Amino acid sequence: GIALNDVMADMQKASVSMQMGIQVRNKLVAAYQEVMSMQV
Amino acid sequence: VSFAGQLHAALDRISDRQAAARVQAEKFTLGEPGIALNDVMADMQKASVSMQMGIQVRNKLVAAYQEVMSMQV
Amino acid sequence: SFAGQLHAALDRISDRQAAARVQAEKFTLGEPGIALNDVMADMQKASVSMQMGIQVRNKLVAAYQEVMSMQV
Amino acid sequence: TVSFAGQLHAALDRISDRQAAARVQAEKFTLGEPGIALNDVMADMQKASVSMQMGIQVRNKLVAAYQEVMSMQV
Amino acid sequence: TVSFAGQLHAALDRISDRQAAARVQAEKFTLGEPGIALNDVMADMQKASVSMQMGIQVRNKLVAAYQEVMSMQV
Amino acid sequence: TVSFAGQLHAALDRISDRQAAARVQAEKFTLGEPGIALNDVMADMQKASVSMQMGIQVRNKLVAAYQEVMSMQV
Amino acid sequence: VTSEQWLYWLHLYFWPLLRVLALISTAPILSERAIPKRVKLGLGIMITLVIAPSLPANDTPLFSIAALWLAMQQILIGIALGFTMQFAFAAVRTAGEFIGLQMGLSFATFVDPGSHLNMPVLARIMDMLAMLLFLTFNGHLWLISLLVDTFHTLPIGSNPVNSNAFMALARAGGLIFLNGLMLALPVITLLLTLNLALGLLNRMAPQLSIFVIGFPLTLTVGIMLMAALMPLIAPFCEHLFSEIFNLLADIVS
Amino acid sequence: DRLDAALRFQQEALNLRAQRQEILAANIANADTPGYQARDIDFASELKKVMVVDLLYRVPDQPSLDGNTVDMDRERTQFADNSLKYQMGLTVLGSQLKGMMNVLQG
Amino acid sequence: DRLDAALRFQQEALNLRAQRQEILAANIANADTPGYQARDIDFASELKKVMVRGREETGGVSSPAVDLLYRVPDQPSLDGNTVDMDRERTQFADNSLKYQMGLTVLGSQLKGMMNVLQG
Amino acid sequence: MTPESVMMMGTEAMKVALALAAPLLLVALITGLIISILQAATQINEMTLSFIPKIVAVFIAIIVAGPWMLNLLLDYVRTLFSNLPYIIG
Amino acid sequence: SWSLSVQTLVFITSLTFLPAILLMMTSFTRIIIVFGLLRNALGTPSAPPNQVLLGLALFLTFFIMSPVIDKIYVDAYQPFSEQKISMQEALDKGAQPLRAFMLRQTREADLALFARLANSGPLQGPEAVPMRILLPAYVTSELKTAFQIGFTIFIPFLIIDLVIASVLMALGMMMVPPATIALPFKLMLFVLVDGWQLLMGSLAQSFYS
Amino acid sequence: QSWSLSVQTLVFITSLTFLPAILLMMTSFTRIIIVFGLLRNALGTPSAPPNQVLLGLALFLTFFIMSPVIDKIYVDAYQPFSEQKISMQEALDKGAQPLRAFMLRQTREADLALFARLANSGPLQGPEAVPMRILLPAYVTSELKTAFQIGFTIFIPFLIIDLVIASVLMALGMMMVPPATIALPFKLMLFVLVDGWQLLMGSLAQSF
Amino acid sequence: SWSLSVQTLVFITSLTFLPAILLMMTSFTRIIIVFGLLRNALGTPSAPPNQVLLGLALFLTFFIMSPVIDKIYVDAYQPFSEQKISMQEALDKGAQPLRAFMLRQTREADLALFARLANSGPLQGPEAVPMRILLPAYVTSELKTAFQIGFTIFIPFLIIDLVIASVLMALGMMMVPPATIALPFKLMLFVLVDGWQLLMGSLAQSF
Amino acid sequence: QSWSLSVQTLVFITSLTFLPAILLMMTSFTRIIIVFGLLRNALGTPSAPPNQVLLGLALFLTFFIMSPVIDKIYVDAYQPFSEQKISMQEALDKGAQPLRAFMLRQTREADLALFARLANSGPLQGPEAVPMRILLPAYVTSELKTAFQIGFTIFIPFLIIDLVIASVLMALGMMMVPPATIALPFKLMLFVLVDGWQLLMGSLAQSF
Amino acid sequence: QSWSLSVQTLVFITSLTFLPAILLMMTSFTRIIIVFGLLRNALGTPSAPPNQVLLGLALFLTFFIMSPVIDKIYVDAYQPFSEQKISMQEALDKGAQPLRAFMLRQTREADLALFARLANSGPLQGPEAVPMRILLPAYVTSELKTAFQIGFTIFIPFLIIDLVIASVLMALGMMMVPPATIALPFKLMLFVLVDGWQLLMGSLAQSFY
Secondary structure, three states: OHHHHHHHHHHHHHHHHHHHHHHHHHHHHHHHHHOOOOOO | OOOHHHHOOOOOOHHHHHHHHHHHHHHHHHHHOOOOHHHHHHHHHHHHHHHHHHHHHHHHHHHHHHHHHOOOO | OHHHHHHHHHHHHHHHHHHHHHHHHHHHOOOOOOOOOHHHHHHHHHHHHHHHHHHHHHHHOOOOOOHHOOOO | OOOOHHOOOHHHHHHHHHHHHHHHHHHHHHHOOOOOHHHHHHHHHHHHHHHHHHHHHHHHHHHHHHHOOOOOOO | OOHHHHHHHHHHHHHHHHHHHHHHHHHHHOOOOHHHHHHHHHOOOOOOHHHHHHHHHHHHHHHHHHHHHHHOOO | OOOOOHHHHHHHHHHHHHHHHHHHOOOOOOOOOOOOOHHHHHHHHHHHHHHHHHHHHHHHHEEEEEHHHOOOOO | OOOOHHHHHHHHHHHHHHHHHHHOOOOOOOOOOOOOOHHHHHHHHHHHHHHHHHHHOOOOOOOOOHHHHHHHHHHHHHHHHHHHHHHHHHHHHHHHHHHHHHHHOOOOHHHOOOOOOOOOOHHHHHHEEEHHHHHHOOOOHHHHHHHHHHHHHOOOOOOOOOOHHHHHHHHHHHHHHHHHHHHHHHHHHHHHHHHHHHHHHHOOOOOOOOOOHHHHHHHHHHHHHHHHHHHHHHHHHHHHHHHHHHHHHHHHH | OOHHHHHHHHHHHHHHHOOOOOOOHHHHHHHOOOOOOOEEOHHHHHHHHOOOOOOEEOOOOOOOOEEEEOOOOHHHHHHHHHHHHHHHHHHHHHHHHHHHHHHHOO | HHHHHHHHHHHHHHHHHHHHHHHHHHHOOOOOOOOOEEEEEOHHHHHHHHHHHHOEOOOOOOOHHHHHHHHOOOOOOOOOOOOOHHHHHHHHHHHHHHHHHHHHHHHHHHHHOOOOOOO | HHHHHHHHHHHHHHHHHHHHHHHHHOOOOOHHHHHHHHHHOOOOOOOOOOOOHHHHHHHHHHHHHHHHHHHHHHHHHHHHHHHHHHHHO | OHHHHHHHHHHHHHHHHHHOOOOOOOOHHHHHHHHHHHHHHHOOOOOOHHHHHHHHHHHHHHHHOOHHHHHHHHHHHHHHHHHOHHHHHHHHHHHHHHHHHHOOOHHHHHHHHHHHHHOOOOOOOOHHOOHHHHHHHHHHHHHHHHHHHHHHHHHHHHHHHHHHHHHHHOOOOOOOHHHHHHHHHHHHHHHHHHHHHHHHHHHHHHHOO | OOHHHHHHHHHHHHHHHHHHHHHHHHHOHHHHHHHHHHHHHHHHHOOOOOEEEHHHHHHHHHHHHHHHHHHHHHHHHHHHHOOOOOOOOHHHHHHHHHHHHHHHHHOOOHHHHHHHHOOOOOOOOHHHHOOHHHHHHHHHOOOOOOHHHHHHHHHHHHHHHHHHHHHHHHHHHHOOOOOHHHHHHHHHHHHOOOOHHHHHHHHHHHOO | OOOOOHHHHHHHHHHOOHHHHHHHHHOOOHHHHHHHHHHHHHHHOOHHHHHHHHHHHHHHHHHHHHHHHHHHHHHHHHHHHHHHOOOHHHHHHHHHHHHHHHHHHHOOOHHHHHHHOOOOOOOOOOOOHHHHHHHHHHHHHHHHHHHHHHHHHHOOOOHHHHHHHHHHHHHOOOOHHHHHHHHHHHHHHHHHOHHHHHHHHHHHOOO | OOOOOHHHHHHHHHHHHHHHHHEEEEEEEEHHHHHHHHHHHHHOOOOOOOHHHHHHHHHHHHHHHHHHHHHHHHHHHHHHHHHHOOOHHHHHEEEEHHHHHHHHHHOHHHHHHHHHHOOOOOOOOOOOOOHHHHHHHHHHHHHHHEEEHHHHHHHHHHHHHHHHHHHHHHHOOOOOOOHHHHHHHHHHHHHHHHHHHHHHHHHHOOOO | OOOOHHHHHHHHHHHHHHHHHHHHHHHHHHHHHHHHHHHHHHOOOOOOHHHHHHHHHHHHHHHHHHHHHHHHHHHHHHHHHOOOOOOOHHHHHHHHHHHHHHHHOOOOOOHHHHHHHHHOOOOOOHHHHHHHHHHHHHHHHHHHHHHHHHHHHHHHHHHHHHHHEEEEHHOOOOOOOHHHHHHHHHHHHHHHHHOOOHHHHHHHHHHHH
16 A cells, blocks of 8 residues: 555645645735735 | 545544554453564554654644645735 | 846856755765765755755845835 | 944954854864864864854844834834 | 832842852862762752743743734834 | 633643642652552653643643734734 | 545645635625634635535646646636626715715815825715625625636636636726716706806805805705615615626626 | 543553562562462452452472472563563553653644 | 656655665565575666656555566575575665665755745 | 615614704804805905804804704714614624 | 544644634624724724734623533533543534534525535525534624624714714815814714723624524 | 642743733723824824834833832732742732722723623622623723723814814915914924923823 | 756745736836826726726736737747746747837837946847846836826816816806816716727727 | 853843834934924925935934943943953943933933822932933933924924915915915925035934 | 855845845935935826836836946956955955945035034045945935935926916916816826926936936
8 A cells, every 4th residue: 555655755745835835825915915005 | 535534534543553552462461362472562563653643644734724824815 | 237146146056956966866876986975965055055045035025025115 | 432333343253253263173173183172173163153143143133123123104 | 119120130140140059069069079969960050951941931921022012003 | 600710720730739649659759658669650750741741732722822813903 | 545645635625715715805895804814714715625525626736837827817717706896886986985075075186186185985985885785685695606606617727718808897997987977966966956056146246155155055965965865875786786796797708 | 530541551560560570579589488388469360450469379389398389480480571571561651651742742 | 747756756766765675674584484585676777667657566465566686695505595684684774774865855855845935 | 684774774874964964064054145145235255254253153053052962973873882783684 | 432642632733723713613703803893983093902902802702602612511521521422522512502603693695505505405404504514604694794783883983074074164174184073073972872881782782682 | 739830830931921911901001002092193193203112101101000009919929929938829819909909990880790791790799709800801991991081082182273273274264275284383382382291191190 | 947946936036026027017007097197187086996996907907918928828838838948948938028018118219218328339129128228118108108198088177177167257157166067077978978998998009 | 249151141132132122212213213204294295205214314313422322331331341340230230320321411300200209219319319210211201302392393494484385375366276286395495405404413413 | 364154144144134225325216216206296196106116117227327336346346256356354345435436426515524523533534534334324314405406396397387377277267276187187298298207317317427
């Protein structure tokens, strides 16, 4: 069956990919709120 | 079936393994025939490894939850 | 100018990372002439350079945000 | 007239001097110099590390104070 | 007539006296003064470390609380 | 009628009486009173240590939750 | 055993979460700053937990430009839905502000445009009345349901897109004005007549009128007129919500 | 306390091993006393009784003239075995406590 | 895809280290069995093979698709096994250190990435 | 909860506003009209002398009817806050 | 049952989600939104230094959730602490009173919508609703109720500004800001009509009704 | 009976987390800070003195007001506890008394009655029967109400100046000027010629 | 191709400048200024919320960038997958449509001024204008274009206001303010002619 | 009596934490900052000089004004401490004296009396023995009052300009012409011609 | 004599935090954005171009203005630093001189004299010996004065337009017509036909020379 070598490696990736998604969304949301907080 | 179900299944499996190792250790300490010290010690080793795996999974899972709850909305 | 200097710095950091990774890869295959201590030292130097780049990026981004938040 | 820039420069020079002295002593000890002992080398390196950590912490506190003061609405 | 600065000064001074006493006891033991036991030296050193760590934690909590109180929008 | 303060007091009491019982057992075993065994002394001390670690971890979780709730803006 | 494939779960739970949270941050009432951020995040997380297992999971890696295109698509869909919904409240605010400006409530804008002195209090009154009506008609549940439904029409997977469709949302900018006039056409008209009446008074003995007799009379008349006109917004409120909703349904596809 | 229930079995086993170790060493020490009977305890039954002591006489193997029934070989083997089992119980109890600790550390 | 490809070499090397250590432990276990030729794998060639073509299994009783080669015996033995204990324990220790090296490299890379995704 | 209830409470609210503002506005309007007709009769025309008695009249209006407004608005707010948990949906 | 190590691990992990329980399963949410809206209404966006409002909301929630906590303790925590009910059954036993409170206040339309979105079968009675349907339905109902309460709260504080602006405009003082005049009067109103006792009692009734 | 020293250290270092909460909810900080914020709003300028200065000044005022209570606590609880004459729990119980009296003296009856109604309290009896968990929210509510009462009457003179200046300006004819712009210097003049800061501190201190 | 971690760092760093890209590189400034001036024209500085105007400008910007986005997709998004071209060269190729667009929308005078501000003498060709000289010139050209469009919008509303005031004066009224009378007529003219859709059509035609 | 080195560095870092509070409540930063904000409000340009520019100017002016006090602290207190001549406690006590003297020079006796009477301090003979806990709030209050006085006085010439332009526009019949649009350029011209910035900074420095 | 690598990295990262302060108090930025803050007031539209557009335009103009100074710093100081022929201390000493000269040429003598007197500095032999603590605030003061001069001069043609339009409106008996709304489109006309933005930026750049 699946060994610790594979389990840990995929677990870490998934953590890395989730962190990347969170950071990119945070950047996009911050940019959008900066645009909408404008004064026209 | 679901993620909570999978986590519950993993916890039950780990606890069952630990309880089996503990019961075999108590049976050996009891003096009942047929139980070898080799098997007791190896099963305790396996139970410790499984506990450590569960601890690591919990640590990461908590870290990921904290990361998500920090996400800006 | 300034963008050119930033590009040069990023290129140097990435060359550091690539050299360290290639040396570790060659050492993994068992190639002779590459020692473990050199591999570890190069890896740590690459990590230090990358952390310096990250810190410089953070300071520059904070400065840009502070400048752009002024009330004209 | 006491100036804060002069004091900061003096503190940085002291930290750099301690670090350089420790580094020079370690380099000389590696080269097989007779009149240098290992315990002194390690103790000097640890003292230099402590001094540089103190400098880093003071810089962090100063930067926090400056960023708090410059974030006012006047 | 209770002054919080006075109590902070008292606690800081008490920590200082504990550290100085442990340092002087170790100093005297090193010089080979009869009547000093190694176990008591180590015990008093560890007590001094515990007192200093308690002071560090109290300072951390007070500074954090002051920064949370001092950053509210009035 | 439940009481969270009462529950915390009961838990702190449980920890404190466990620690005091282990301490008194060590007291009697050091004094030389018959009937006390060294392995029991060590086991009770380790049980008290585990209980205190339980308390420390629950404290950490509760303080973190309270700080995150109180750091929110309405 | 003990697999727990994490990438599959992450890719199944991520993109629906992105779309739901993008709608949440812009949809009216669900995007108001008074809600704590964690409440909004938890609502999005729970909605995704309910919805995602039924959807086909995507396999594009998070470390690819395809992931960036997907994220841009979800953000676009969510903000488009929320903004098209917000257009109705924009129209109500416009109508209220215009009724208030014909009240003479803020006369300083005619002399100093945008001079940090403006109080569209009627606009706020009818804006919060419109929010109360939207809450009553359960518009937010509909919004959530349509956010779910746009999957069948437009799946998570990158799909090609159209053009004049965007114009439609931009062209919805006309409705804010058009429907706005439809809310202000009766009352303003009578106010207009009142002002006309005041003109007849000024055609008599010069000066000694307007700025001394016109303002209180027109203020009281506007107050009681639109107090009587309050029962009228609710059918127009439902009309506005229906317009926004079926425009969204027609154009999102 | 629930913590006691988890560690009750190993603590009782460890205490019983220590008591039986003392009894065996008393048998060794009194090997030369004429008229001394070699006493021992049945580990399993007493462990049941404590979890839910009485001394049993050892069956003599060789008849001595002074009435001493202590046999060197039998009790030396039992002493070594009890030492080994005491070490094993210490190992198991320490492992359980260390696991309970790494669950909490963080 | 990009992150998966960047971390694939060290991950595969670490998996091959694990399989080689399983083989070496099997050799150590069978060290007193009469008529057992010691088995070992060529790490570099099998590592390149697994990278170019993905990992595969004989069945799945399951086992890897690695080529189990025979070790040349040092000195003869009447029972008929070629497990020389010095060679086994040297390869075991070397594989141990190389597996720890792989863990260190992979952990360093993953931190080197969390540092970036850390703002 | 029903839209009829929403519009009824809105209408009652804004009639309360009308009752609060009607005395002051009406007093100001009457003073302005009186000063204007006096100006027309006397053939006097300055746009500033109509502003003088208006302030005094409107300020007296709070003296006389101010307690009534303060008692009406407080009663309205009190009743609204008391009936808040019965118009929930 | 689980091993003691597993039980301790689960207990420590579950201690993390306390803010989530407070925000998404408790009265705290519609005990705050109202406070934020009221603070927006009076024109003092700082006034009660937040922390003050958070502490008041925490005490109000503790006073309001008292019967639910009592029922959980008597039915789940007491048997669990006395080794009569296992750790994996105390959670299930205690999740029922909270689920019932979560229902007593969760509207229908939301329940129907989230029963449709899950593609679940017909729910003839409330006893067939799982937590996966009740959670977001309760959250949405609480948000809507809080916003309704706040929006009927907002009306008098805008009425005062309206009448202030109209009175200022009657006399021709068109360049006087109305907000600066209205703020002291809004404070006077909120002082006079027991601003907080009435609001506190109204919120508490809004829960128990 | 006494707690172990490890338990005492744990409780003592955990209790320091509630220091901002104690200062805000339980002391005079809330009323002073609310009055100060309302006074800036009333001055015509929203952020003339930085929030930091006002926060530090409010902290000093709170310390000076509460110094008698702190002295009573030190005499009753801190001093006999530090000399190892009473336990920790009994020291806390004894030291809660002067703070309870201070909280009661400024507590509205209606607030206490309401929060006793919501806590199912039945036969209360002596003012010395109110529990801390009932007394605290009533004290907070009374403090908020009192701060609002002080603020809305602090607002009065500046409204008087604003109305007088606007009326004079418009009656004179210059109706296109912004009255607030001309009024702000006069608000500052009134605040400095009355000694507004000193008198305001005197009033805030006397309010207790 | 350089390191993946450096690529992640650069990507997340470049994500920060998204408002800068939207404002300086696209047309968003033009639509936002046109909307602000149009709002100032009708006499109501808060009739449509700033949020709604910003979102409408965002949608208009997305449509009017759709051809440039398509060119970017053809030149950068697709070949980055087939790996015929990738990395910084593909990034420059994808940025090329943005130049072409910004060259199209930029006046010659602004580019000439910003070149003589950088001492770039040998800038002879018009497709090799550096970004440093192209960007602020493009922004200034956008400001001028937006102001011109705002004045063109202003003309009819100014005419209506003047006509209303003239009729009020001719009819004998000397005290009635013409703004109150002219506001609803401004709105009925704006709605009746359907000003909004023609305005967006002209803006799209304005490129 | 001398603190051990670890305690000394703990005190040093903890004191460095309190740096903005010392700058705001013990130096001349607060008065300069308040006057600058009021001046910016007075010109009709609420955001013309960015907050960071004015904050930097106030910081430099504060450093220049407090240079004599810092020199006294260095010569009398810090220099012997750096040469290990005196301990940290006595060095801090010696360094308090010049700063207090400076703060006492710029405080009002009425505020000192208010805070002394509020704190129930016993009779104090002369300025030699006044606790810092008493002097700091009184100095802060005096600084606030002085800053408001200076700002209100500064508000006068711009008020003159606004009134004269409004009257000139009104006497011409221009009833609906707002005076702010015409007054702002002339306010800028007035401030430029009188060399306003350097004159105001010199006046602020001379008042200390 | 050279600093250690750790100290050099610490100093560099610490000095990276002062970037907005350096930009405001040492470069051209202060004069530019302030003028923009006034220009948007002169046009009658406080909204104007958005704040971020003006800030970025000022940043680009500042970079173009300081291109010679940046080039001189790069040549004289940073190039030996990269090519290892200088230390960090000597680089900091040498690179500031061109920037000090740039600051001095735009510094009014009166402000410099004021800050000398206020620091009680000794007799400065010549410009070259002026301390930075004296040159920085004096430069900021002169910068503010020059920016206000430029802004007031800018305010002129729009005042001309407003006065002419108001006089035309009043000469026709149209007394009740607010001239601001009428004159705003003509201000936009004036800024468009004369190419106001390009002319203003050219004037600013030439002013710094």
